[PDB]
């Protein structure tokens, strides 16, 4: 199936309190595997997966220096932005970037991304064509010109279709046993009392991977979406995920409801009753 290499980057200024904090966090699919935190004791690129320990000193040193280069580059960007936006030097500010690539089964780039945000708002992003930019506001237009004049979209097109794809191949290779696995979810229904002779049936899905899953409650046929409460799939600390969907039903009538779990790790979907 498809796979992706994404990096979440954050640069947040701390005027008066010191130097900006810079972080680079990387993900191969739903797994964190690398991180760089400038607020760390000794700022080095660190492996966040056991399989990345296969990478040697040249990798770690090369990545560390690159991270430090980006860090120093964002410190310049932060100040630059204050000007574009007529901002005082007192406030704290944040620049975020999502950068990565998704390749399909055949190995062709399905999607490449490079998008920026400032203070939680879209700033500028590379388009689908990997040739043009979309600026979010007046200030972004300045960067857009600076980038067109620099042939930046070309540089990125090269990274996305080239380097990004090659490295994703090396990662999936080095950690195939972990990254290409599939943990089927274990589900169970919990009962809960409440006012007006009502009850809360909560369907739980635990210990699965990858993160995509579907949980639905049904009244013997119909999927109760509108009248069902549920949380966003969330990490459980050891590389797997969990989720739950609840529905409030009239007491004594719980035995008419079924929960259905849909996940790629199962031969057939699961069906549970309290």
């Amino acid at each position: 199936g498809p796979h992706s290499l994404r990096y979440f980057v954050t640069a947040v200024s701390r005027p008066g309190l010191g130097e900006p904090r810079y972080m680079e966090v990387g993900y191969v699919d739903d797994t964190e595997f690398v991180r760089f935190d400038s607020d760390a004791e000794n700022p080095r690129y660190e492996p966040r997966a056991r399989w990345m320990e296969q990478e040697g000193p040249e990798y770690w040193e090369r990545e560390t220096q690159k991270a430090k280069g980006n860090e120093q580059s964002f410190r310049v960007d932060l100040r630059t932005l204050l000007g574009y936006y007529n901002q005082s030097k007192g406030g704290s500010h944040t620049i975020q970037v999502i950068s990565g690539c998704e390749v399909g089964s055949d190995g062709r780039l399905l999607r490449g991304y490079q998008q920026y945000a400032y203070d939680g708002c879209d700033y500028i992003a590379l388009n689908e064509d990997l040739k043009t930019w979309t600026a979010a506001d007046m200030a972004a237009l300045i960067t857009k010109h600076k980038w067109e004049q620099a042939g930046e979209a070309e540089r990125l097109r090269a990274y996305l279709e080239g380097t990004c794809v090659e490295w994703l191949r090396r990662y999936l290779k080095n950690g195939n046993a972990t990254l290409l696995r599939t943990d089927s979810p274990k589900a169970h229904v919990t009962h809960h009392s409440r006012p007006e002779d009502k009850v809360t049936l909560r369907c739980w899905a635990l210990g699965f991977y990858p993160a995509d899953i579907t949980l639905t409650w049904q009244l013997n046929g119909e999927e109760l979406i509108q009248d069902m409460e549920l949380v966003e799939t969330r990490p459980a600390g050891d590389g797997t995920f969990q989720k739950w969907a609840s529905v409030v039903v009239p007491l004594g009538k719980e035995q008419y409801y079924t929960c259905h779990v849909y996940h790629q790790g199962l031969p057939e979907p699961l069906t549970l009753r309290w």
Partner: peptide
């Protein structure tokens, strides 16, 4: 490997 960024 993440890309090296350009200035805004």
């Amino acid at each position: 490997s993440i890309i090296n960024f350009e200035k805004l």
